[PDB]
Amino acid sequence: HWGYGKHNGPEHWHKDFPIAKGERQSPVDIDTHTAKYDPSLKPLSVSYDQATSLRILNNGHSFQVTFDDSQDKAVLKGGPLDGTYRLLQFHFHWGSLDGQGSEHTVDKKKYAAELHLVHWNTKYGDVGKAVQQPDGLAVLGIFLKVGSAKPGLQKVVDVLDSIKTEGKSADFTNFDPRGLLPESLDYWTYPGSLTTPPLAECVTWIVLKEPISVSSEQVLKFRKLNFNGEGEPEELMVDNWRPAQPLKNRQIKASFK
Numbered sequence: 001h002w003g004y005g006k007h008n009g010p011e012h013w014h015k016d017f018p019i020a021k022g023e024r025q026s027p028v029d030i031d032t033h034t035a036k037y038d039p040s041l042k043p044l045s046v047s048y049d050q051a052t053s054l055r056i057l058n059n060g061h062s063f064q065v066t067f068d069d070s071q072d073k074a075v076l077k078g079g080p081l082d083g084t085y086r087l088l089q090f091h092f093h094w095g096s097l098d099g100q101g102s103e104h105t106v107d108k109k110k111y112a113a114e115l116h117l118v119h120w121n122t123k124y125g126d127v128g129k130a131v132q133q134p135d136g137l138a139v140l141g142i143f144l145k146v147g148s149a150k151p152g153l154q155k156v157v158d159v160l161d162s163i164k165t166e167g168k169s170a171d172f173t174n175f176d177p178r179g180l181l182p183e184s185l186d187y188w189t190y191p192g193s194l195t196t197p198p199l200a201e202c203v204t205w206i207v208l209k210e211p212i213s214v215s216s217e218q219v220l221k222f223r224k225l226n227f228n229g230e231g232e233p234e235e236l237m238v239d240n241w242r243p244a245q246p247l248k249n250r251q252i253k254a255s256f257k
């Protein structure tokens, strides 16, 4: 029922998911001058060498690449985190045009897209239990700007024609998510939420300062995806981003000066 349209979009979500108006909702605007450098924050540890991608899926709100999370093969640790978080999936948010698409903003700047790598805390055993905990999930967010192509993204772009409509999936083995990361792991962090229903307040957000560049041809392929199923009136999967929510009583911390 929920989506990104006039009648079912973000301004409507609170009716089915009242936590939409909660105290720690995501995304937020990152005010770079107000974020506090925290010299106590550790470097982020990203261990993706043994990642096992399984499937690529059009879920009617995004596309996602799913990983084997039945063992500690692709894990996030350190940074603001206590313990070990397993990579479950990555997905994107993007715009109809390059001047919007990101969920987080930086001094009100919107990027063309935002990559989310979703991880869950192994101490809760499964992602369904982790989403019920305030420290259940860690989402690594990476901004996309349009310029030079990202070679590590092309394997993803080239299969999107095979998952055009909602629920369509394909084999997507041997994909290396290290090819989507920028040089720097400098980050901002704050306590927040899932940015789609059920909007659970279970996420430690880690948003990298350095964007990756993708080409216009790569993001154009995102914009050919459809929100609709098969045989239903064609609606381009574009503008699948929630806007910035109130920061309320939260501090954004920077890992860098």
Ligand SMILES: C[C@@]12CCC[C@H]1[C@@H]1CC=C3C[C@@H](OS(N)(=O)=O)CC[C@]3(C)[C@H]1CC2
Residues within 6 Å of the ligand: 116, 118, 127, 128, 131, 139, 193, 194, 195, 196, 197, 198
């Ligand atoms: C399947 C599930 C119930 C148990 C685990 C839940 C997952 C956990 C994480 C996310 C990531 C979120 O996107 S975002 N933008 O916040 O990273 C979209 C929603 C989704 C897929 C939940 C949907 C409902």
Ligand SMILES: [Zn+2]
Residues within 6 Å of the ligand: 091, 092, 093, 116, 195
């Ligand atoms: Zn997301």
